[PDB]
Design a protein around this ligand. Sequence first.
Ligand SMILES: *CC(=N)NCCC[C@H](NC(=O)c1ccccc1C(=O)O)C(N)=O
Ligand SMILES: *CC(=N)NCCC[C@H](NC(=O)c1ccccc1C(=O)O)C(N)=O
Ligand SMILES: [Ca+2]
Ligand SMILES: [Ca+2]
Ligand SMILES: [Ca+2]
Ligand SMILES: [Ca+2]
Ligand SMILES: [Ca+2]
Ligand SMILES: [Ca+2]
Ligand SMILES: [Ca+2]
Ligand SMILES: [Ca+2]
Ligand SMILES: [Ca+2]
Ligand SMILES: [Ca+2]
Lengths: 624, 624
Amino acid sequence: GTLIRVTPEQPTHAVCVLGTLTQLDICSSAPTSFSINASPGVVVDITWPLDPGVEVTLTMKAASGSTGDQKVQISYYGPKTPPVKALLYLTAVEISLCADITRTGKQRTWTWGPCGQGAILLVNCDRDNLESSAMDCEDDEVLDSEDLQDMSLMTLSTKTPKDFFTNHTLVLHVARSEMDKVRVFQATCSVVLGPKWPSHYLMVPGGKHNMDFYVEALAFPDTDFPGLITLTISLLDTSNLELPEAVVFQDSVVFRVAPWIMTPNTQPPQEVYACSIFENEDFLKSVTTLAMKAKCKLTICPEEENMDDQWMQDEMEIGYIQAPHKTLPVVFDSPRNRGLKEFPIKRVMGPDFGYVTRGPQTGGISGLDSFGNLEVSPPVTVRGKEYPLGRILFGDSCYPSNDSRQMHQALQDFLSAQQVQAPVKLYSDWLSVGHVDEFLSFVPAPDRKGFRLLLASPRSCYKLFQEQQNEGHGEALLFEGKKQQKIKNILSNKTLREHNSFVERCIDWNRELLKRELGLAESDIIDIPQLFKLKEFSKAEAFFPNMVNMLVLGKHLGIPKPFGPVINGRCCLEEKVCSLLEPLGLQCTFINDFFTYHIRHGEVHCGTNVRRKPFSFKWWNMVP
Amino acid sequence: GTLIRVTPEQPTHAVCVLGTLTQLDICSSAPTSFSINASPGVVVDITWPLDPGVEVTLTMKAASGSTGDQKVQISYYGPKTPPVKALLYLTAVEISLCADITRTGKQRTWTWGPCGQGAILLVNCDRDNLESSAMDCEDDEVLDSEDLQDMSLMTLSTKTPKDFFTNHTLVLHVARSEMDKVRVFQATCSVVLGPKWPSHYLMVPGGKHNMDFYVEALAFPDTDFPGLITLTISLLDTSNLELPEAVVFQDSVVFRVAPWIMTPNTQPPQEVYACSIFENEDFLKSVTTLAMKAKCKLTICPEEENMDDQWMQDEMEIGYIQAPHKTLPVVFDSPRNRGLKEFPIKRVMGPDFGYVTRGPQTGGISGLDSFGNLEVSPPVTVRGKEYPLGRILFGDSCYPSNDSRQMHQALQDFLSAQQVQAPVKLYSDWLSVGHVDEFLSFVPAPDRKGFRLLLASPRSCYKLFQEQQNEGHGEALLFEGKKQQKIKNILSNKTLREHNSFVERCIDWNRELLKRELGLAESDIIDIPQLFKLKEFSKAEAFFPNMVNMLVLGKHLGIPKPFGPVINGRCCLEEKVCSLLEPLGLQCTFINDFFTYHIRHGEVHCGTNVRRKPFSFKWWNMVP
Ligand SMILES: *CC(=N)NCCC[C@H](NC(=O)c1ccccc1C(=O)O)C(N)=O
Ligand SMILES: *CC(=N)NCCC[C@H](NC(=O)c1ccccc1C(=O)O)C(N)=O
Ligand SMILES: [Ca+2]
Ligand SMILES: [Ca+2]
Ligand SMILES: [Ca+2]
Ligand SMILES: [Ca+2]
Ligand SMILES: [Ca+2]
Ligand SMILES: [Ca+2]
Ligand SMILES: [Ca+2]
Ligand SMILES: [Ca+2]
Ligand SMILES: [Ca+2]
Ligand SMILES: [Ca+2]
């Protein structure tokens, strides 16, 4: 809106911006009746009576060529009076601040969805600079023209009379609350807005001009940042030299900072990671083969950088950030800060590879803070609400006690603040190590919802063993090929069966948690045979290598080698698992991980990581 | 949900909680065809074939009298087989956690609105304890039974067999993220949940029992607290003595903490405040009269406690918090921390009087942080969105610069986090002092929307003076009854008219800001005649006492005495204002505030404060 106020005691000079509703105050200094005659470029909606209800409104069709080149004449006449005249001289200008608010690569509110509106900003948290230790956004400089591709275009367009900025100035600003979270460079780079600076006078020439800005974000959405940054242009009248500058017009663009998004096992793999370790050459060769079959590059951290840390699942999680103009992978580096600590910083973070961390870095850290305790489900629809990018899953206790553990609050808050994968707290504190990958995986399926949840299941392993004893193989030896144990003795062991009944309860609680939060039906779930035992603090560990803890590379599964009882040439555990999964068109390979991984309380999934293809569905089309 | 898993190789013992969907796993250990026969208290939905699609579901009608007193028999028969039988013994219990979730005084999601759902918690931030300096909630103790009335009732009801808690235990908990924000006392007080303690074992006897808890909140909604606290009961199986406790059932109540809410001038007054100061007796007498006419108690801070601080509008804002069971007023104490600093702490905070503060208390403080720069509009509906408790208004600059000021971020965030009065940033930085009460007030009206916005208006004062000169009074003296000035000289003064044109722009910008954000139409607005002048840093001060800066006590207005030009016995400024407002049925009194207040850059509204009647509309029925 804008009130132009007119008098007959003087002519008034005003500016109108195209797209704005200007209104005329005719009554406040009038002296009955009035008529309005305006130049041709000024259209007036509304031989008229001076009732204070009288709405007079002015609209311009085009930018002025010169100052005051449009004109409105208001005359106040009546019953026996010749006219008193009030003059108004207008200058019309275009001032459009544009960004990719339709989300194609190109209100001031941001809206979610396919019919929604608002531009997107990436946190510029990768490292396109050769030989540097810090993220691109840690400084107020654009060093490589490659770096501009990560940034979002914003354009100011002006159409004015040549002499217009003799008396007006334009300023760009961000609220002080948000200046720490955005940086803005003016294009022909040097910064115009940023953490040191919430506003800047633009240097624009009269006539027809177009000025490009490049915007990056410096922070992901989090507890104290919902994730919107508004940038505003204000047109100032600076024509009286004594008086302060007067604002004539503001306009704004609202951006939303892209969340950090995980990729489930159902997304096709692109790159694999693991460590080289002492006597581990045959584990590493086995993964290499599997990668080849699934078409993945492969990367190994060596014994020098490892610091003898083998658990490549735990220190990091590879995600992505996504904007219409640019999608890039970003690593979320766990505060667990073990031997693998540096590997996210030096080796993964890089050209088109983002970085992020959270949590206390000098410690105050559970094991539930390791990223074997961070998964995502596949996409899933739950009582009519779509989670098209899946729902994040992480382990916890059922309630908080003195003895209980949790993933650190700052990570919990970060994941939720991401919004787009509405986390779900599962129960994993019953496990010694405490990770959800210890009792669940997800695999692609050619039918139903296009996946299956695999849950570890003692019951199924009791059933198998019983079905083998029933068919005469009670003398068969677990751990054939450590102390061997026979199926008749495993089965009759009453205390082992109590432990496994209690693990069964823990897994079952989660089965139903996943059935409700994730929309699953029993035909979405397969049980993998798996025995556990309780050890220190009645916490659970795998009795034999945890098969459900597997590397999923599309259809090629790297499953820990259970070394089960060998019947008619084969491990019955291997055969049972193949019978459960081959009908889905999965290919099971069984990798020896026993003295290398299993005895140190982890398996194949725990010894490795995977980068996968980001979802084709665009996060901003969700309506969380 | 819950899977009971049955075998024919053993009978199983399970518990069912009333209101829960129990399901039976018949296939996992079956050995074709099955039938189900259950005791009379167990109803089974579902002479049946063993297809793994077969859904079997169990529902109980009532609490068990003894353990295992209901019974399910599953038999697996077939083509030539007599039955193998699997037994299941059930015990049914009631475990209901109840609170005032319908909001009358009496899903686990909280919902806004008249058809919404969820209990309400008050921050227990008043001081019902005699002789104490701290808020009730600063400690983990309930000292007065009066204090319980501020708290929210929550009840656990159990119906079990007598011997039930021999093998089960109940625990109450809050997530660790929220334990710093709630405290929970068990009733016959001593705490069961709180900032030191996120869980507690309840001591409940078998049979029919009912246990009351009293809940208070320790924190208002704010940037890092959306304002929901969930409390959960979990039923644990503790019958195997080696094994960890197993969760059998959780249920929860979600509370929402009440926001802090302001009251506009359109709400009827209840109590008035001001200071006793040096030569100010006649200001104080004038307010006293006005209070009496409007039926308000009256309170004065004396020269001893003042520390010579006269600005009773600035240090505090009296609001309220509201819950079905209890509504109480709460003072929001400004960080400006001037001479009035202690007055909120010692004199206002008290029995059924809450307290809150925000911002850096040792300074880093603008003048825009004073609470003359905090107002609320009346209730208002804006393009179809209702703000039934009004919208908070506070002053700012138009953009951020080196020289510009703002209300401190922590207050800004606090007000927004309150949600229910969606703040609006107005432009007041152009004023020397910098407060929105310097250019706007609101008054009750008997028509239209039931109020008017009054805006300071130089134009209207130029018009009046011109209309008086026109009728021959150019020689009339402003400041009659300091150096006097005549209407002909005020009018011809060209530099005074430039200042006032520039103030006109500043007020006009806000007029349209309020027209859009607040839904107003011109017939909602009255202009009060008011001249300003520009002084240090071209910042604006009142040329004569700022009339729009008035005390509104229902229909009785305490307006600063302008001491205008006296024409036919009367100040024309007084007469113009009376002509604008008497037709609304307002009663204007003009209070001398000139050497006492006006020359120290403030007026009557600035010398005073008011507590008013909280809205009848309940904040939780809004849908922000
Ligand atoms: C599935 C998963 N994410 N597993 C990670 C579990 C492995 C580590 N293990 C150890 O720290 C460990 C245990 C015994 C002996 C040596 C070591 C070691 O390599 O330091 C864990 N428990 O977090
Ligand atoms: C309308 C409103 N909220 N006004 C408050 C403005 C008053 C104070 N004034 C002073 O601090 C002041 C100015 C000059 C001489 C003495 C004093 C004084 O009492 O300390 C303000 N400017 O904030
Ligand atoms: Ca940079
Ligand atoms: Ca970059
Ligand atoms: Ca780390
Ligand atoms: Ca890049
Ligand atoms: Ca993971
Ligand atoms: Ca207390
Ligand atoms: Ca109390
Ligand atoms: Ca204070
Ligand atoms: Ca009280
Ligand atoms: Ca106020």
